[PDB]
Amino acid sequence: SVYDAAAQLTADVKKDLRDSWKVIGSDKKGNGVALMTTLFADNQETIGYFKRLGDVSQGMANDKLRGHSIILMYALQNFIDQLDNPDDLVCVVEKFAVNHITRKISAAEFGKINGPIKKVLASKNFGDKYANAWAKLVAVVQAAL
Amino acid sequence: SVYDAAAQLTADVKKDLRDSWKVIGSDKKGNGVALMTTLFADNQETIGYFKRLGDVSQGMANDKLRGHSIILMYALQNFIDQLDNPDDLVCVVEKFAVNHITRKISAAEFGKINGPIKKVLASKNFGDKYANAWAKLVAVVQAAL
Ligand code: HEM
Numbered sequence: 001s002v003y004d005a006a007a008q009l010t011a012d013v014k015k016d017l018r019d020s021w022k023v024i025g026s027d028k029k030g031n032g033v034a035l036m037t038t039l040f041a042d043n044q045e046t047i048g049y050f051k052r053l054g055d056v057s058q059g060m061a062n063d064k065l066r067g068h069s070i071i072l073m074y075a076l077q078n079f080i081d082q083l084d085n086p087d088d089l090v091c092v093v094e095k096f097a098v099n100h101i102t103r104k105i106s107a108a109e110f111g112k113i114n115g116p117i118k119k120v121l122a123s124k125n126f127g128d129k130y131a132n133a134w135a136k137l138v139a140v141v142q143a144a145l
Numbered sequence: 146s147v148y149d150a151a152a153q154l155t156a157d158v159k160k161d162l163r164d165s166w167k168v169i170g171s172d173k174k175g176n177g178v179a180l181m182t183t184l185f186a187d188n189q190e191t192i193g194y195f196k197r198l199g200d201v202s203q204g205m206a207n208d209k210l211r212g213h214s215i216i217l218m219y220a221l222q223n224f225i226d227q228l229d230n231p232d233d234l235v236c237v238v239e240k241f242a243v244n245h246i247t248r249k250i251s252a253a254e255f256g257k258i259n260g261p262i263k264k265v266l267a268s269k270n271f272g273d274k275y276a277n278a279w280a281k282l283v284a285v286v287q288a289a290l
């Protein structure tokens with residue numbers, strides 16, 4: 001359950017999340033768009049959920065994709081900012097989960113974002129330690145789906 | 146058409162928005178809930194759109210309303226951050242608008258948030274000049290609805 005999954009965010013996980021977000025979150029447009037095109041490249045079957053975005057291979061030049069990618073990064077910003085207070089983290093994760101549940105995005109489907117995250121981290125010289133901290137935050141959202 | 150309403154955000158308007166946001170956005174939970182509870186108090190009929198939140202009379206103590214309130218404030222953070230690049234502001238506002246159009250929230254209904262914003266600004270002693278600027282930012286969204 002999500003209260004139990006939020007409890008796996010221990011002190012070192014929280015610190016590694018903030019330390020990597022300080023670099024990733026510096027360029028929300030650039031890293032958000034890179035996140036999404038890596039998801040589409042590595043997991044082409046997820047493009048069906050994003051029909052409204054139009055031609056996803058245009059990347060940055062697709063205004064709808066660029067708008068979605070920037071907004072996605074503010075949801076991550078929000079989660080990072082709630083790490084101090086588990087009660088606020090949980091109520092924000094459950095609120096966020098509503099629209100993903102309506103779209104029938106399962107926990108297994110959501111978990112496909114981990115591969116893209118690991119790759120964007122790796123491009124900024126953040127290794128496995130950080131990829132695993134981010135997998136634990138994505139697991140809090142998965143528990144709400 | 147959003148680009149035309151965005152043209153109204155002149156250099157002084159953007160400056161007032163950024164300066165008031167420096168204070169308002171520094172307590173996203175507190176000021177987010179104050180906007181929402183002021184909206185419900187002043188325009189009781191808007192509660193019709195928020196049946197999922199349950200008992201909105203609990204204010205801050207209602208986890209679903211607190212979750213919604215914090216997420217609302219990250220949408221405004223995003224808008225403030227895109228003010229200097231009209232192309233990004235417009236693709237973010239148009240993406241944001243999609244779910245509100247599906248909820249059948251008209252431009253007039255959305256415009257009811259202006260009284261709440263004026264009151265939260267005035268509680269932090271930002272007068273009519275700042276309220277005016279915020280009405281012009283809300284107008285960019287209204288142009289997308
Ligand atoms: C790091 C993970 C993710 C974050 C932070 C995230 C964030 C968001 C945000 C903030 C929105 C806009 C608000 C809303 O409509 O709910 C959104 C929309 C959406 N998300 Fe997620 N999401 C993530 C992963 C995923 C994944 C893995 C899928 C599906 C395979 C997914 C599918 C969708 C879809 C289909 C939309 C709507 C796109 C549109 O038509 O405009 N999301 N997501």
Ligand code: HEM
Nearest residue numbers: 191194195197198216217220221244245248250254255258
């Ligand atoms: C300053 C203005 C506003 C901002 C920045 C804002 C922001 C947001 C955000 C970020 C979401 C979550 C993503 C989504 O589902 O679309 C949302 C949801 C929603 N908004 Fe807005 N919104 C604003 C005003 C309004 C107004 C005036 C109404 C209607 C009277 C409205 C009704 C809704 C509803 C019903 C939801 C879903 C709530 C739920 O989770 O059940 N919004 N809004």
